[PDB]
Enzyme design. Structure first.
Site, PDB file in Angstrom:
ATOM      1  N   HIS A  33       0.808  -1.192   0.000  1.00 49.59           N
ATOM      2  CA  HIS A  33       0.000   0.000   0.000  1.00 49.59           C
ATOM      3  C   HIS A  33       0.861   1.270   0.000  1.00 49.59           C
ATOM      4  CE1 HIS A  33       0.235  -0.460   4.451  1.00 49.59           C
ATOM      5  NE2 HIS A  33       0.306   0.859   4.380  1.00 49.59           N
ATOM      6  N   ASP A  63       0.365  -7.715   0.705  1.00 49.25           N
ATOM      7  CA  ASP A  63       0.820  -6.381   1.113  1.00 49.25           C
ATOM      8  C   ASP A  63       2.320  -6.241   1.171  1.00 49.25           C
ATOM      9  OD1 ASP A  63       0.845  -3.664   1.753  1.00 49.25           O
ATOM     10  OD2 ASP A  63      -0.734  -3.811   3.235  1.00 49.25           O
ATOM     11  N   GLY A 139       2.783   5.765   9.805  1.00 43.40           N
ATOM     12  CA  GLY A 139       4.161   6.047   9.506  1.00 43.40           C
ATOM     13  C   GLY A 139       4.961   4.791   9.709  1.00 43.40           C
ATOM     14  N   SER A 141       3.938   1.759   8.720  1.00 44.99           N
ATOM     15  CA  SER A 141       3.661   0.895   7.554  1.00 44.99           C
ATOM     16  C   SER A 141       4.932   0.500   6.856  1.00 44.99           C
ATOM     17  CB  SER A 141       2.762   1.622   6.567  1.00 44.99           C
ATOM     18  OG  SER A 141       1.394   1.376   6.811  1.00 44.99           O
ATOM     19  N   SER A 156       1.604  -4.043   7.924  1.00 48.65           N
ATOM     20  CA  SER A 156       0.549  -3.671   7.018  1.00 48.65           C
ATOM     21  C   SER A 156      -0.485  -2.725   7.592  1.00 48.65           C
ATOM     22  CB  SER A 156      -0.108  -4.915   6.392  1.00 48.65           C
ATOM     23  OG  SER A 156      -1.435  -4.660   5.875  1.00 48.65           O
TER      24      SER A 156
END
Lengths: 185, 51
Positions: A33, A63, A139, A141, A156
């Site tokens: 993402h 992901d 942040g 991720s 994720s």
């Protein structure tokens, strides 16, 4: 630069998962993402230091995403912060894990479930996710989930926060390493 | 930002800040919108970017 460090695209900020390689070509993994719709990646918010360009992106459903290093001088440490990483492995229920992100830093916890389905809405569904009781916030991720010197997953999404606690889902990193024919070092 | 599809049990966690009426910087829209729900609709967007 290393796992957990901040990375900026044109849209926002994420974290670097792990530094990986194939032959003599260096890449770095992060969340899908985050790579979805991004081309260039920088090491600072000023965007004065270039990291590389997106070479692959898989989300939703999975992901993970990979970015090819174009910067030839920046250090590409095979660690997470100062934590050396020497291999990757499959998560197991009860496994003790640690996450590092650009927002919250390092936080630990345990794997509480496997093969989870997370519905982020609007058709954004991811499958085969690792469930944990580690907190994480915006942040974080794409940051690494490790266990000692073993790479385990990529951050994720989830719920809650580090103050009141929460649940975080991770993408198994073995699957990303296999899709791209890359490996940790 | 429209929070009709909320609440959502999970959010991806990339950083793209929004400033809420409670002066709190929310890390991204999924976070912001879930809070709006939790506030029972009393929380509003003040501006885009950090507070």
């Amino acid at each position: 630069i290393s796992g957990g460090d901040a990375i900026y695209s044109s849209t926002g900020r994420c974290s670097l998962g792990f530094n990986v390689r194939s032959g003599s070509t260096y890449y770095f993994l992060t969340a899908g993402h985050c790579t979805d719709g991004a081309t260039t990646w920088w090491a600072n918010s000023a965007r004065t230091t270039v990291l590389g360009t997106t070479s692959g992106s898989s989300f939703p459903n999975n992901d993970y995403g990979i970015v090819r290093y174009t910067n030839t001088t920046i250090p590409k440490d095979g660690t997470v912060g100062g934590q050396d990483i020497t291999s990757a492995a499959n998560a197991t229920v009860g496994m003790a894990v640690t996450r590092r992100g650009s927002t919250t830093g390092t936080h630990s916890g345990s794997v509480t479930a496997l093969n989870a389905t997370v519905n982020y809405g609007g058709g954004d569904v991811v499958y085969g996710m690792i469930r944990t009781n580690v907190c994480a916030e915006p942040g974080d991720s794409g940051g690494p989930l490790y266990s000692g010197t073993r790479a385990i997953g990529l951050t994720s999404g989830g719920s809650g926060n580090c103050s009141s606690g929460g649940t975080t889902f991770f993408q198994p990193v073995t699957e990303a390493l296999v899709a791209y024919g890359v490996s940790v070092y | 930002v429209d929070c009709s599809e909320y609440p959502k049990p999970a959010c991806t966690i990339e950083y793209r800040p929004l400033c809420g009426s409670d002066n709190k910087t929310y890390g991204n829209k999924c976070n912001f919108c879930n809070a709006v729900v939790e506030s029972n609709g009393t929380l509003t967007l003040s501006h885009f970017g950090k507070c």
